[PDB]
Design a protein around this nucleic acid. Structure first.
Ligand SMILES: [K+]
Ligand SMILES: [K+]
Ligand SMILES: [K+]
Ligand SMILES: [K+]
Ligand SMILES: [K+]
Ligand SMILES: [K+]
Ligand SMILES: [K+]
Ligand SMILES: [K+]
Ligand SMILES: [Mg+2]
Ligand SMILES: [Mg+2]
Ligand SMILES: [Mg+2]
Ligand SMILES: [Mg+2]
Ligand SMILES: [Mg+2]
Ligand SMILES: [Mg+2]
Ligand SMILES: [Mg+2]
Ligand SMILES: [Mg+2]
Ligand SMILES: [Mg+2]
Ligand SMILES: [Mg+2]
Ligand SMILES: [Mg+2]
Ligand SMILES: [Mg+2]
Ligand SMILES: [Mg+2]
Ligand SMILES: [Mg+2]
Ligand SMILES: [Mg+2]
Ligand SMILES: [Mg+2]
Ligand SMILES: [Mg+2]
Ligand SMILES: [Mg+2]
Ligand SMILES: [Mg+2]
Ligand SMILES: [Zn+2]
Lengths: 100, 56, 69, 208, 99
RNA sequence: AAUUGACGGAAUGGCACCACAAGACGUGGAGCGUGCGGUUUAAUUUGACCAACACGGGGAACUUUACCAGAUCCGGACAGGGUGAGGAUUGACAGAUGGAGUGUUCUUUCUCGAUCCCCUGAAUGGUGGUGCAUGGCCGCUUUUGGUCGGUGGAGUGAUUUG
RNA sequence: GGUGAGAUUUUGGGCAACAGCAGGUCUGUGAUGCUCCUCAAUGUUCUGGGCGACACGCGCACUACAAUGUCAGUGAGAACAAGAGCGACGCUCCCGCUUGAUCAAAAGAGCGGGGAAACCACGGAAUCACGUAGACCCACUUGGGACCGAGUAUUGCAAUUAUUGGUCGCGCAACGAGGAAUGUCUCGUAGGCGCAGCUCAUCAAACUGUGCCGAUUACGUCCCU
């Protein structure tokens, strides 16, 4: 456990492309990788009355937001990590690098 | 000393009277979950842009 | 709708015509000019600020510092 | 350091305010949407428009004014925010642009039916599969009613109709009251992902 | 609190001309912060609103509002007025006028 | 005299636990929590009467607050007329006055220094009215299987076929 | 009937046409036309009251009328979730372990952890179980807990018209299964049992979700609506 890369997004397709291409860069250099880990997906929920005034049958709306997280572990030297993760990210994906 | 008295209670900053909707400044039926601070009527109109989707 | 009280007056500022002729006294002694009022010792006020000299106390217009006899 | 779920909510709230500020400011100009992206060196915001020259202004005066507004509001550091303008390939397939064009025509004292039929005819020529225009209010005297004008296909139920139908609503403030307009455009290809088939269409490949 | 001293009026006008845009939050118990080549200055939100309201009654200001925030922009007539008021040279223009 | 609806303690064929049948657990009787009406009150702010009545996300100590008894501020921009650096105006210690040892006003005399002040228009703000002037949204008709053109056929026609 | 994890829209939801209603909302908005007030103001703020006040009628909940029980012990055992930057040098939210303790609860104080699959946490929920050789024995009784008295600690700028929690008294307040009338429901459902979120400085007999124990009856009809 030298470098931990954590990616989170609200778009499932976007977060998979970032993970897959990051693995591509690591393999093209031949740096050892602990396979990507799919952390539990979270749902944020809000329930509100539909009416703006409070008349009629009491009906409700349910709104949901899904958050996807992926974890990739790399064991590589210092300057090698910046080279590997220097590429640009798609919109809506947050990437964080942590040294445990 | 009338300026010391002008908005003395509003300066304390506690209770329902210290919170405003960040869109319309109304003080009724706020949604405080996840620190949203949007009233329930304004949330329904802006829920799509914020990122909430009706699925179930 | 009925108040049963005299109406509030509004303050308005009292005008002292040529008020700067006081606070200064000139003597023939070429003339020598001395100030007839005291300055506020508060560092933030300065030498251009005078004291009210009420009947029984001295008062500063801006700092509101008061000296009672 | 804020948690991940708090950061996702904050980003959505920022985008919603930016969208509302732009649609109020860029009204009377073709406004079709905004894309916001974060980079290590700066933050990029792309504004989609039908009249790009109107958005840019003389030289780049108008677009620099918009940058100064956003930088001050969100406390952006100098050189950390940049704005771009790009044009829509097909103006007639944008529900937001068509609704604001209709609102301008109504304020210019035009007949309701003539104005609505003009938008529908332009959209159909642009290559849409269907169009729907609804106008409601005191169009006649003193008693509110509503009309609808239709053409072509349209789907209204299920979930797939959100990937294919573009809709927008606007308010028009006349001297006797407010009148609402709503425009729906059914587009070829999905707005979400291209090469997507309709939910209930089956095709059989011809044998070799 | 709506009594604006002359020194604060000149600082706000000078910041306005240099940038060309002023943004403020509608809040009676608020403070507005700005910088003029360093040397940050502050004044109550109510005083900023009074100055902009007077400018908008004249034909020198364009105003926009969205989500509890003001946005003020100078127009060509306002640029002319500010130049005489601040005794600037005829070649002076706000920012956003320079490529 | 004909046409389309609605209705029938007139027929035909189906359907539904917001219908029944076979049953279960309850409510209606008691205490208490909460909402509505009434009475009382200075005020007990107010909307709504299957599809109003733990509904207005309405579990209100102050705030919220819209009601009642009193006190302050201008947040009346701008335009015209007038006072105005020989001073237009702001604020205030101490004593009284007000419920109020942070000038509301009064006595007193310092402070600020063209930001105002007085008069006339205009303009702003309003949880003020009017939802029977409106937009948007929601409820219900209506949880069932229903709706509409084009061209062609029938009728003087309303209409009908599909 | 078979094959099968599952056998009929697989099981639950979401979406849902065309025509309307003088249904509701001008108390959501910098949505809005006419109209009203506009400097002793229907604008705004501050102090104090009220929104709750009680001879009564009505809707909806919670707790019971006991032994298929109450009280006191021992045993095993869930899911959904949440959590921190104006006014007072960082802090401000949610928890754990010690200590207080040579003597109640409720507090107070030290030391730590968590940005939440890393803390709380091996998540010791309540119905439940016990060959516990436990207490009670058909009575308005150790059923039931309304009403009321006295002392305490905490939230808050402020607790009187008791904010809330905890302690000892009151239990001689009804209530012993509820007339006419009436609601919901077909399988992990009804009923019973708790927990989290939300509103929230402090308060849940409410609502929105979640799990636990777990049935009787029908597989029809057009008699009533
Ligand atoms: K049938
Ligand atoms: K119903
Ligand atoms: K309406
Ligand atoms: K026909
Ligand atoms: K109105
Ligand atoms: K009430
Ligand atoms: K009633
Ligand atoms: K409630
Ligand atoms: Mg279809
Ligand atoms: Mg369907
Ligand atoms: Mg006849
Ligand atoms: Mg019934
Ligand atoms: Mg009863
Ligand atoms: Mg019905
Ligand atoms: Mg309360
Ligand atoms: Mg009050
Ligand atoms: Mg008011
Ligand atoms: Mg209003
Ligand atoms: Mg109406
Ligand atoms: Mg109306
Ligand atoms: Mg109506
Ligand atoms: Mg219905
Ligand atoms: Mg024909
Ligand atoms: Mg007991
Ligand atoms: Mg006790
Ligand atoms: Mg007790
Ligand atoms: Mg007893
Ligand atoms: Zn002094």
């Amino acid at each position: 456990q030298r470098v931990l890369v954590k990616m989170t997004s609200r778009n499932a397709k976007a977060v998979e492309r970032v993970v897959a291409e990051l693995l591509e860069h690591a393999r093209t250099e031949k740096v050892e990788v602990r396979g990507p880990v799919r952390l539990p997906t979270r749902r944020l929920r809000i329930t509100t009355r539909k009416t703006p005034c409070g008349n009629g049958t009491n009906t409700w709306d349910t709104f949901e937001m899904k958050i996807y997280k992926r974890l990739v572990d790399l064991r590589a030297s210092t300057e090698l990590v910046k080279k590997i993760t220097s590429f640009q990210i798609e919109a809506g994906v947050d990437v964080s690098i942590t040294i445990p | 000393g009338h300026l010391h008295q002008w908005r003395s209670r509003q300066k304390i900053g506690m209770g329902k009277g210290s919170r405003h909707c960040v869109i319309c400044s109304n003080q009724k039926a706020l949604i405080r979950k996840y620190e949203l601070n949007v009233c329930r009527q304004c949330f329904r109109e802006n829920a799509e842009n914020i990122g909430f989707v009706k699925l179930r | 709708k009925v108040f049963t009280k005299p109406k509030k007056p509004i303050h308005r500022h009292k005008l002292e015509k040529m008020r700067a002729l006081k606070y200064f006294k000139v003597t023939e002694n070429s003339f020598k000019v001395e100030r007839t009022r005291d300055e506020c010792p508060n560092p933030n006020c300065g030498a251009g600020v005078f004291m009210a000299q009420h009947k029984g106390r001295k008062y500063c217009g801006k700092c509101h510092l008061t000296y009672t006899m | 350091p804020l948690s991940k779920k708090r950061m996702m909510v904050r980003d959505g709230v920022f985008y919603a305010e930016l969208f509302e500020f732009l649609k109020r400011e860029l009204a009377d100009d073709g406004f079709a949407g905004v894309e916001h992206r974060v980079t290590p060196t700066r933050t990029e915001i792309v504004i989609r428009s039908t009249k790009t020259r109107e958005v840019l202004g003389e030289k780049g005066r108008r677009i620099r004014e918009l940058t100064a507004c956003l930088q001050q509001r969100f406390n952006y550091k100098e050189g950390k925010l940049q704005l771009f303008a790009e044009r829509v390939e097909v103006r007639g397939l944008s529900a937001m642009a068509q609704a604001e064009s209709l609102r301008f025509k109504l304020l210019s004292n035009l007949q309701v039916r003539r104005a609505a039929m003009g938008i529908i005819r332009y959209v159909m020529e642009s290559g849409a599969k269907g169009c729907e225009v609804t106008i409601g209010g005191k169009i006649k005297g003193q008693r509110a009613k509503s009309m609808t004008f239709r053409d072509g296909y349209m789907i209204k139920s299920g979930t797939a109709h959100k990937h294919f139908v573009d809709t927008a609503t606007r308010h028009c403030h006349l001297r006797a009251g407010t009148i609402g307009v709503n425009v729906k455009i059914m587009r070829p290809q999905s707005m979400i992902e291209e090469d997507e088939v309709l939910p209930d269409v089956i095709t059989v490949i011809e044998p070799k | 609190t709506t009594y604006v001293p002359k020194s604060s009026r000149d600082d706000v006008y000078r910041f306005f001309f240099t940038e060309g845009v002023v943004s403020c939050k509608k809040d009676p118990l608020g403070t507005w912060k700005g910088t003029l080549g360093g040397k940050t200055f502050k004044l109550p939100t109510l005083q900023v609103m009074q100055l902009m309201r007077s400018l908008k009654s004249r034909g020198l200001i364009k105003e926009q509002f969205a989500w509890r925030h003001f946005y003020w922009t100078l127009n060509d007539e306002g640029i002319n007025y500010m130049r005489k008021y601040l005794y600037l040279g005829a070649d002076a223009v706000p920012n956003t006028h320079k490529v």
